[PDB]
Protein backbone atom coordinates (compact mmCIF):
# COMPACT_ATOMS: atom_id res chain seq x y z
CA UNK A 1 0.00 0.00 0.00
CA UNK A 2 0.65 3.76 -0.37
CA UNK A 3 0.95 6.80 1.98
CA UNK A 4 -2.07 9.10 1.35
CA UNK A 5 -3.14 10.78 -1.86
CA UNK A 6 -6.51 11.82 -3.42
CA UNK A 7 -8.37 8.50 -3.69
CA UNK A 8 -9.11 10.97 0.46
CA UNK A 9 -9.47 14.79 0.75
CA UNK A 10 -11.64 17.41 2.43
CA UNK A 11 -14.58 17.05 0.02
CA UNK A 12 -14.76 13.23 0.02
CA UNK A 13 -13.19 12.12 3.35
CA UNK A 14 -15.10 13.12 6.48
CA UNK A 15 -12.09 13.13 8.82
CA UNK A 16 -10.15 15.34 6.40
CA UNK A 17 -12.94 17.94 6.26
CA UNK A 18 -13.05 17.89 10.07
CA UNK A 19 -9.27 17.86 10.60
CA UNK A 20 -8.50 20.72 8.20
CA UNK A 21 -11.16 22.83 9.97
CA UNK A 22 -9.71 22.63 13.49
CA UNK A 23 -7.77 25.68 14.68
CA UNK A 24 -4.78 25.51 17.02
CA UNK A 25 -6.04 28.56 18.93
CA UNK A 26 -9.35 26.79 19.61
CA UNK A 27 -8.11 23.48 21.05
CA UNK A 28 -5.01 24.51 23.01
CA UNK A 29 -2.17 22.67 21.23
CA UNK A 30 -0.79 22.46 17.68
CA UNK A 31 -2.87 20.38 15.27
CA UNK A 32 0.27 19.25 13.45
CA UNK A 33 1.78 15.81 14.15
CA UNK A 34 5.07 15.57 16.01
CA UNK A 35 5.71 11.96 14.93
CA UNK A 36 5.52 11.26 11.17
CA UNK A 37 1.98 10.50 10.02
CA UNK A 38 1.06 6.84 10.52
CA UNK A 39 -2.08 4.73 11.05
CA UNK A 40 -3.44 3.16 14.21
CA UNK A 41 -2.56 -0.52 14.72
CA UNK A 42 -3.63 -3.26 17.12
CA UNK A 43 -0.62 -2.91 19.43
CA UNK A 44 -0.85 0.89 19.52
CA UNK A 45 -4.55 0.73 20.37
CA UNK A 46 -4.04 -1.83 23.16
CA UNK A 47 -1.11 0.11 24.62
CA UNK A 48 -3.11 3.34 24.53
CA UNK A 49 -6.12 1.66 26.17
CA UNK A 50 -3.96 0.45 29.06
CA UNK A 51 -2.21 3.83 29.31
CA UNK A 52 -5.59 5.57 29.52
CA UNK A 53 -7.19 3.20 32.03
CA UNK A 54 -4.36 2.48 34.47
CA UNK A 55 -3.84 6.10 35.60
CA UNK A 56 -7.41 7.42 35.78
CA UNK A 57 -7.72 9.39 32.56
CA UNK A 58 -10.64 7.88 30.65
CA UNK A 59 -12.18 5.17 32.87
CA UNK A 60 -15.55 6.21 34.24
CA UNK A 61 -15.46 9.39 32.15
CA UNK A 62 -18.79 10.63 30.81
CA UNK A 63 -18.83 10.78 27.02
CA UNK A 64 -18.93 14.12 25.17
CA UNK A 65 -18.43 15.06 21.53
CA UNK A 66 -15.91 17.68 22.68
CA UNK A 67 -14.17 15.00 24.74
CA UNK A 68 -13.92 12.50 21.90
CA UNK A 69 -12.73 15.24 19.57
CA UNK A 70 -9.85 16.41 21.73
CA UNK A 71 -8.91 12.80 22.47
CA UNK A 72 -8.60 12.21 18.73
CA UNK A 73 -6.72 15.52 18.42
CA UNK A 74 -4.29 14.94 21.30
CA UNK A 75 -3.45 11.40 20.18
CA UNK A 76 -3.01 12.58 16.58
CA UNK A 77 -0.75 15.42 17.74
CA UNK A 78 1.40 13.44 20.19
CA UNK A 79 1.56 10.17 18.22
CA UNK A 80 0.75 10.94 14.57
CA UNK A 81 -2.24 8.59 14.45
CA UNK A 82 -4.85 9.87 12.06
CA UNK A 83 -8.36 10.32 13.54
CA UNK A 84 -9.84 7.51 11.44
CA UNK A 85 -10.06 5.21 14.41
CA UNK A 86 -12.33 6.17 17.34
CA UNK A 87 -15.66 4.94 16.03
CA UNK A 88 -18.28 2.91 17.87
CA UNK A 89 -21.33 0.85 16.98
CA UNK A 90 -24.71 2.63 16.60
CA UNK A 91 -27.98 1.73 18.29
CA UNK A 92 -29.18 1.96 21.88
CA UNK A 93 -27.03 0.12 24.40
CA UNK A 94 -23.32 -0.54 24.66
CA UNK A 95 -21.17 0.94 21.89
CA UNK A 96 -18.36 -1.38 20.93
CA UNK A 97 -15.13 -0.12 19.32
CA UNK A 98 -14.99 -0.68 15.57
CA UNK A 99 -11.18 -0.65 15.75
CA UNK A 100 -9.94 -4.05 16.89
CA UNK A 101 -7.44 -3.53 19.69
CA UNK A 102 -9.03 -0.35 21.06
CA UNK A 103 -10.16 -1.66 24.46
CA UNK A 104 -12.84 0.91 25.25
CA UNK A 105 -16.62 0.66 25.04
CA UNK A 106 -19.36 3.20 25.75
CA UNK A 107 -21.94 1.97 28.27
CA UNK A 108 -25.17 3.87 29.04
CA UNK A 109 -25.61 5.27 32.54
CA UNK A 110 -28.65 4.21 34.54
CA UNK A 111 -31.43 6.83 34.66
CA UNK A 112 -31.45 6.83 38.47
CA UNK A 113 -27.75 7.72 38.62
CA UNK A 114 -28.16 10.25 35.80
CA UNK A 115 -30.87 12.01 37.81
CA UNK A 116 -28.79 11.72 40.99
CA UNK A 117 -25.98 13.51 39.13
CA UNK A 118 -28.34 16.34 38.09
CA UNK A 119 -29.84 16.77 41.56
CA UNK A 120 -29.17 20.11 43.20
CA UNK A 121 -29.35 23.51 41.52
CA UNK A 122 -25.58 24.15 41.54
CA UNK A 123 -24.82 21.76 38.66
CA UNK A 124 -23.07 23.26 35.65
CA UNK A 125 -25.49 23.46 32.73
CA UNK A 126 -23.03 22.63 29.92
CA UNK A 127 -21.28 19.69 31.59
CA UNK A 128 -21.38 16.37 29.68
CA UNK A 129 -23.47 14.82 32.47
CA UNK A 130 -25.88 17.78 32.12
CA UNK A 131 -26.52 17.26 28.39
CA UNK A 132 -28.77 14.16 28.61
CA UNK A 133 -27.31 12.51 25.53
CA UNK A 134 -27.30 15.74 23.52
CA UNK A 135 -24.22 14.59 21.59
CA UNK A 136 -25.74 11.12 21.06
CA UNK A 137 -28.04 10.29 18.12
CA UNK A 138 -29.90 7.90 20.45
CA UNK A 139 -29.89 10.52 23.27
CA UNK A 140 -28.13 8.25 25.78
CA UNK A 141 -25.74 9.34 28.53
CA UNK A 142 -22.63 7.30 27.71
CA UNK A 143 -19.58 6.42 29.79
CA UNK A 144 -16.12 5.20 28.80
CA UNK A 145 -15.30 1.76 30.20
CA UNK A 146 -12.30 -0.50 29.67
CA UNK A 147 -12.75 -4.14 28.68
CA UNK A 148 -9.97 -6.71 28.29
CA UNK A 149 -12.15 -8.98 26.13
CA UNK A 150 -12.16 -6.30 23.41
CA UNK A 151 -8.48 -7.09 22.75
CA UNK A 152 -9.25 -10.74 21.91
CA UNK A 153 -12.90 -10.54 20.78
CA UNK A 154 -13.76 -8.22 17.89
CA UNK A 155 -17.30 -7.66 19.15
CA UNK A 156 -17.89 -4.77 16.73
CA UNK A 157 -17.40 -6.87 13.59
CA UNK A 158 -19.25 -9.84 15.07
CA UNK A 159 -22.33 -7.75 15.89
CA UNK A 160 -22.36 -5.49 12.83
CA UNK A 161 -20.40 -7.13 9.99
CA UNK A 162 -21.69 -4.72 7.33
CA UNK A 163 -18.99 -2.06 7.76
CA UNK A 164 -16.16 -4.49 6.97
Amino acid sequence: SRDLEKHNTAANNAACAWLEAQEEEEVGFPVTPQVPLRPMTYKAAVDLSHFLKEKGGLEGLIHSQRRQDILDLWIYHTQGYFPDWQNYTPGPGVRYPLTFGWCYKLVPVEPDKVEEANKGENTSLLHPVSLHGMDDPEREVLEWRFDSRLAFHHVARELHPEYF
Partner: peptide, 14 residues
Amino acid sequence: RMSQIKRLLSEKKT
Protein backbone atom coordinates in the same frame (compact mmCIF):
# COMPACT_ATOMS: atom_id res chain seq x y z
CA ARG B 1 0.02 -3.68 9.36
CA MET B 2 -2.80 -1.42 10.61
CA SER B 3 -6.31 -2.17 11.95
CA GLN B 4 -10.11 -2.21 11.24
CA ILE B 5 -9.76 1.49 10.55
CA LYS B 6 -11.33 4.00 8.10
CA ARG B 7 -10.11 4.80 4.56
CA LEU B 8 -7.35 7.32 5.22
CA LEU B 9 -5.43 4.96 7.44
CA SER B 10 -5.90 2.23 4.85
CA GLU B 11 -4.11 4.69 2.56
CA LYS B 12 -1.11 4.94 4.93
CA LYS B 13 -0.32 1.27 4.63
CA THR B 14 -2.01 -2.14 5.12
